[PDB]
Amino acid sequence: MQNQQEENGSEISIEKMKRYITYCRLKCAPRLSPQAAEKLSSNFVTIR
Amino acid sequence: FRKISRDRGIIDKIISSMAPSIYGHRDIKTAVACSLFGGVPKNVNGKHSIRGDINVLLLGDPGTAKSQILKYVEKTAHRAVFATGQGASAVGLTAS
Numbered sequence: 079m080q081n082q083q084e085e086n087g088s089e090i091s092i093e094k095m096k097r098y099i100t101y102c103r104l105k106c107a108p109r110l111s112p113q114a115a116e117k118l119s120s121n122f123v124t125i126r
Numbered sequence: 127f128r129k130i131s132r133d134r135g136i137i138d139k140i141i142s143s144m145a146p147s148i149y150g151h152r153d154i155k156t157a158v159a160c161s162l163f164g165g166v167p168k169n170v171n172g173k174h175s176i177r178g179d180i181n182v183l184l185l186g187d188p189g190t191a192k193s194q195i196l197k198y199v200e201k202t203a204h205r206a207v208f209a210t211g212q213g214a215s216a217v218g219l220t221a222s
């Protein structure tokens with residue numbers, strides 16, 4: 079079943095996951111948008 | 127081997143052949159037979175691994191002949207290594 083799903087593409091292979099994790103770690107470092115900041119500042123103070 | 131394994135009572139005969147110097151401990155001998163024969167270790171699709179050998183713990187009051195069972199397994203198994211915790215004249219379990 080895992081082989082069939084990996085042929086399908088709903089699950090990707092472990093070595094390919096490792097190489098993709100390395101690629102995303104070296105290439106991408108996202109920033110939060112300013113419109114994404116006030117929601118965290120509200121959803122963090124409501125817990126407190 | 128095929129001729130003797132074709133017999134219906136091969137498993138009970140193997141269990142009875144376990145440790146002839148040991149008397150009356152059929153359950154221990156059965157566990158020893160499972161540990162000596164072992165199962166199938168399986169690595170499915172590389173990611174998930176399942177152990178395929180039986181680990182047996184003989185917890186007993188002293189004088190119940192656990193040591194003689196261990197020496198029988200040592201004489202019987204292909205690669206059996208004896209180790210002890212309290213004693214010193216043995217191969218250590220820690221790598222060094």
Ligand SMILES: Nc1ncnc2c1ncn2[C@@H]1O[C@H](COP(=O)(O)OP(=O)(O)OP(O)(O)=S)[C@@H](O)[C@H]1O
Binds near residue numbers: 148187188191194
């Ligand atoms: N069911 C049994 N059949 C045959 N011999 C037995 C049986 N139970 C005990 N013995 C004998 O009792 C003695 C026990 O010695 P060991 O097995 O070396 O000690 P032990 O059973 O490991 O217990 P410890 O080491 O004090 S925790 C041996 O001489 C055995 O042969």
Ligand SMILES: [Mg+2]
Binds near residue numbers: 192193
């Ligand atoms: Mg002992």
